[model samples]
Every structure is written in structure tokens, then in C-alpha cells.
Target: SMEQVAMELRLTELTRLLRSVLDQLQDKDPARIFAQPVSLKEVPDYLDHIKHPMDFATMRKRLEAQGYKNLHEFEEDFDLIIDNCMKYNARDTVFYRAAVRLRDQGGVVLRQARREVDSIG
Candidate 1:
């Protein structure tokens, strides 16, 4: 029981951290747009745009798989996820701005996790 408790405790901690991260992203802006993978029926040209797509839903699954070695790895997926929007949508559109919204205001638990980028408008 001792060894099992030890293993379960850390497992709970790891899952909790990533789960909070995923929930925070969803809670901050209250947008389902980034919560799930985009579909062709929703946006016909989605595949024409992002070759590697990601979403919070997928991130959640990845979290359960214990795929992230460190919080940095989780952050990597988010950076790419947000960048997908920044690259695919027109600058003037809400999707683009929403992506920037998360990028600029969305970090949690890793204040020093900030990455350099151009100032937002």
C-alpha cells in the first residue's frame, strides 16, 4: 500500500496540474472554438491550413496518457495550438485576435514561461 500510495499521489499531482491548465484556457475566454478540433464541415479549408492541428480536448487526452514529461512539454502543445490560429486566420479576424488573447494573457503556473513575440495591438 505504501508504494502504491506514493505512486498514486504523484500521479494525481501531475494530472491535476495539466488539467487545471487545460481548464484555465477554456475558462479564461469562455470559447468552445479552441476547446475541440476544427472540422471540415465547420471550416471547409481547415485542412488546407494547419498540417498539425491541436486543441484543448486533444491536450486533455494527451494529459491522461501521461505524455508530457514536464510542464514545458504541455506548454509546447499550447504554443503550437495558438500559433495554428495565428497562422491560419486573417489578422483582422476574431479567431486571430482570440489566439493572441490567450498568448498574451493566458499563462498560469509558469510566469517565467513567457516567450518573446511582437507586441499585440
Candidate 2:
């Protein structure tokens, strides 16, 4: 029981660290191309809003072909792309932020489900 509690605490700490880093990155450029803030709810529309949306789709396919079977595998590339966008493309940066938010939120939901199952047993 203590082990599970410890693990949950660690997860919470990691989540806090990640949120801090993401907040810093978001602050690097406050001006977003979109009228509204970036969010998971607007991800689909945000994809369409970007100028080179197809390039992102093509890059995903290429990464998948290159052995990135899941989001974890492709996360570094996403980070790199986002980091580059931070300097070169503000609109693209916001779009990628939405994508990252979607991925991170999915991780949060999955972990929550796991915790529920563990508690049940």
C-alpha cells in the first residue's frame, strides 16, 4: 500500500514538473495565431488552421514508418518540432501546443483509469 502511495506521489510530482516546464514554454511567446487559447477541444480545428498541416501529417507517417509505434516513441520529434517553431513559427507553435496538450491529457486519463482499477482490486 505504501509502495502504491509512493508511486502516486511520484507521478504527481512528475506531473507538476511537466506543467512547470510547459508553462514556461507557453510563456516564451504569448502571441498565438488563433483567436482563442490552444486546447484539446480545438485540436482538430487547430490542425486545419495551420498553414502546413499536411506536412505534420506526412511527418507523423514518416515517424511511424521509422519505428515510432506510439506517442511516446514520437514525443521527442514533436518536442523538437515545437522547439523549432518557438523561434521560427509562432502559429505552428500554438498548433503543436494543442497536439501536446491532447497527448498529455490522454496520458492523464489513462493513468486515472489505471488508478481506479488498482483501487478496485
Candidate 3:
């Protein structure tokens, strides 16, 4: 019973940590490019190019659904979102640069999360 309670506490804290990450990313996306899923009907080739598609809205749904078991999983999805953007767009494009900016910002957020996880654990 004690173990169960402890485990729940960990999960609850993790959920809060991930939520802040999501919110931070959302705020940074001035163009709202990563806010929603890409329209498959418009960008049909996206499926052919990027194997895994991820977005903030979808990630939030997953977070709410308790889909991410750990921070590693959450981070993977975050990377996927950035990677997918860079994959389809060229380096000179705004989309590609935006992904780069997001990745850099994401790095900081992740590091802070790591520190919190370690110290708070």
C-alpha cells in the first residue's frame, strides 16, 4: 500500500512537470505551427516522408490520457515533432528554422525538468 501511494505521487509529479513543458512549448510557437496536427488531406506526402508525426495538441491529449509513462517517452515525442518539421522542409525555410529554435528552447526546458526530477525525486 505504501509503494502504491509512492508510485502515484511520482506519476502525479511527472504529469505536472510534463504539463509545464507542453505549455512552455505552446507559448514559444508564435506561428502556432506546432499547435495542431498537420492536415493529411493537404500534406499527403507528409506521411510518405515523416514516419512519425507529433504535435503539441496531440501530445497534450496523450498527456491527459496518461500515455507517456516517463519523461523519456515525452521527450521522444517532442523530438519527433521537431524532426518531422525539419524533415519535410528545407533548411532555408522558416519552418526548418522554427524547428531549430524549438529544439534549442526544448533543450533548456528538458534540462530544467531533469534537474527538478533529480532534486525532487
Candidate 4:
């Protein structure tokens, strides 16, 4: 289907652009790069707000148990999952669905964290 193909291409391009942005911040910590001043300050609260549907919580715990000590670590892991999903064109997989939910939830947290940082700074 042309629509599916176009959507996949768009997703692939989006993933590439995100990778480039992260690459440009190669030397910075994920917290600094993604959440700036707030970094992981509101992460626990953010997690609490967004944790639901079981799968999201499960992945969050998995990352934490794997030594993802902060939001930054989880952000990177989310990016990796998304990137892999795009790379493999895994639109229908459970992992891809999980990645999409995490990405969307994380975006909210990122915005809140940014606002908190702005207010403080």
C-alpha cells in the first residue's frame, strides 16, 4: 500500500533526524541533553503521572533495573527502541506500540521538565 509505504518512510526520516540531534549532543549526558536543568528532578513524579497500561510500567522498570538511573537513560532507551522500530519497519509489533506510548508520555514529561527549568533559571 502506498499509504503504508509513505508512512514508513516518514517514520524512518523522523527517526534519522532524531538520531542526528542526539549525535550532535554526543558528549552531554542524556538528562542535560533532553531535560536540561530539570533533568531527572521531576522524573519520579512524571513516571507516576504516566505509568499505566502495565506495559509502559513494565518497560520503565526494566530500564531502571538495567541501571537506567535517570530520565536521561530512559530517554535514550526509548529513542533506541523507536529507532529500531523504524529501522525494522515494525509498526505492528508489541515493542513498537510500547515505544510509541513511551515516546508520547516522555514528550509530556520533557515539556514539563523544560518549563520547570525555565521557571527556576
Candidate 5:
């Protein structure tokens, strides 16, 4: 549910970007301008190359203050799913909403993890 919400928001943002791109393209009419097969590549690699949000150095410090030694361990499993959803379909209205919801749900887990780590040093 949380992921769904996130997905929607993400999709909305993406669609807005797409619309902008489309508007720019409309002026040139790429379809007619190029007499060849213009292969527009959707680059997912760029998205995949990003570090996970929880992996940020600042985040580690926050977790350390909270006492989270195994923060990465806890998050590792969900990383792919979340990352894929965000990277792949984040631009789609339906999927974007789902991701927002997932992020919200995971927020609770993240908070719990923070509390656990905060209790340490």
C-alpha cells in the first residue's frame, strides 16, 4: 500500500517529465525529422547505479547514533524490489503510487531500526 502511494507520486513526477520531453519533441517532430530508425534508449543503468538511500553516509551516522549495526542487513533483502520498482516503473502512475505506499510502510521499519540503533551509543 505504501509502495503504491510512492509509485503514484513517482509516476506523477515522471509523467510530468515525460510530458515536457514530449512537448520538446513535438516541435521537431522526431518521427518525421529523422529518416532513420531513431532508437531512443530508455537507460535504466543510470538509475541502477545510484546508491540506496539507506546507504548514504549521513544515514549511517544516524543509524549508528540509534544503535543500528545491522541496518544494511535488514534493508538488503528489500533493496532489489524497491530499487527495481522505483527504477523501472516509477514513471507510471499506477506503479508510482504503489512505490510511495511501499516507502511509507518501510518508513515504520526504518523508524524502528533507528530506535534500535539509537538505544545503543
Candidate 6:
């Protein structure tokens, strides 16, 4: 029972961490990373207040169309802008930097998730 509870807690924590990361990345300047001129109208209404996979997809398409190849590519292109913003004296946790770092190295975390779920099942 202790193991089960701990596993559940870890899973929840991981999910929360992942979500926080995504939120942080979204809060950054979208225009710079996109590598294309995209109006808000080009995005879906479902993205009104939340950043969904669809938003990523739309951005990916736009960036790719504009010759940006992948997520890392776009991120690298915009990192300077983001880094500067995060460097301000009162800069708070924004999620993008941490989230991107986690996502870029997510194999272990994803494996952990699978292991935890397998243990439960």
C-alpha cells in the first residue's frame, strides 16, 4: 500500500511538472519561435486560454513552412529572447526553460511513468 501511494504521488507530480513546463513555454513570445507570420486567427479557438497539442501542431506547421525544421530548432532560434526575459532581476518561474529542458531529456521520466503504471496494473 505504501508503494502504491508513493507511485501515485510520483505520477501526479510528474504530470504537474510536465504541465507547468508546457505552460511556461507557451507564455514566452510565440511570434519569434514560429519563424513565420501567423495571425491569432490562424490558430484554433480551443487555444483561447490553454496551450494544447493542436496549438503546437499549428505552430510546428507554420515554422516548418517557413523552413524551421523542428522544435529544438525553433526553440534555439527564440532562446535568446526568452533567456533575456528570464534574466530580469525579478524574473519568476515561467516554465518554458525548465519545461523544454525536461521535455528534451524526457526518456527517463517517461520510462518512470511506464514503470509506475505497470506496477499498478
TM-score of each: 0.75, 0.34, 0.91, 0.34, 0.35, 0.27
Which lDDT value does model 2 have at 15?
44
Please give the lDDT score at residue 100 for candidate 6: 48
Better of 3 and 4 by lDDT: 3
Which candidate tops lDDT? Answer: 3
Ten-residue stretch with the least lDDT total in model 4 = 30-39
Model 5 lDDT per residue over 10-103, tens place: 5454334333322332223232321122122644454455444332233234333433224455455335444645665556566545555555
Rank the models by lDDT, top first: 3, 1, 4, 2, 5, 6
Once model 3 is optimally superposed onto the true structure by TM-score, how far is the C-alpha of residue 117 displaced, in angstroms? 1.1
Off by over 4 Å in 2: 34-121
Candidate 2 at 30: error in angstroms?
1.6
The segments of candidate 4 whose C-alpha lies over 4 angstroms from its true place after superposition are 1-78
Model 6 per-residue lDDT tens digits across residues 19-86: 43334555443443422322447644523533322234444444434444223444443443334333
Q: Which scores better on lDDT, 1 or 5?
A: 1
Q: Report the lDDT of model 5 for residue 67.
A: 34
Best by TM-score: 3
Worst 10 residues of 1 by lDDT: 112-121
Candidate 5 C-alpha error for residue 11, in Å: 39
User: Relative to the true structure, how large is the alpha-carbon lDDT of every model?
Assistant: 0.75, 0.44, 0.87, 0.44, 0.43, 0.42
In angstroms, how far off is 88's CA in candidate 3?
0.7
After aligning candidate 1 to the native by TM-score, how far in Å is the CA of 46 from where it should be?
Answer: 2.5
What is the C-alpha lDDT profile of model 4 across 1-121, one tens digit per residue?
8998976665454444334333433322233222221123645453343322122233434533434333354456556544544443368876456556656655665556545434533
The TM-score of candidate 6 is 0.27
Per-residue CA lDDT of candidate 3, range 78-101, in tens?
A: 899998999889999999999999
Residue 35, candidate 6: C-alpha displacement in angstroms: 15
* Model 3 ranges off by over 4 Å: none
Pairs that collide in candidate 2 are none
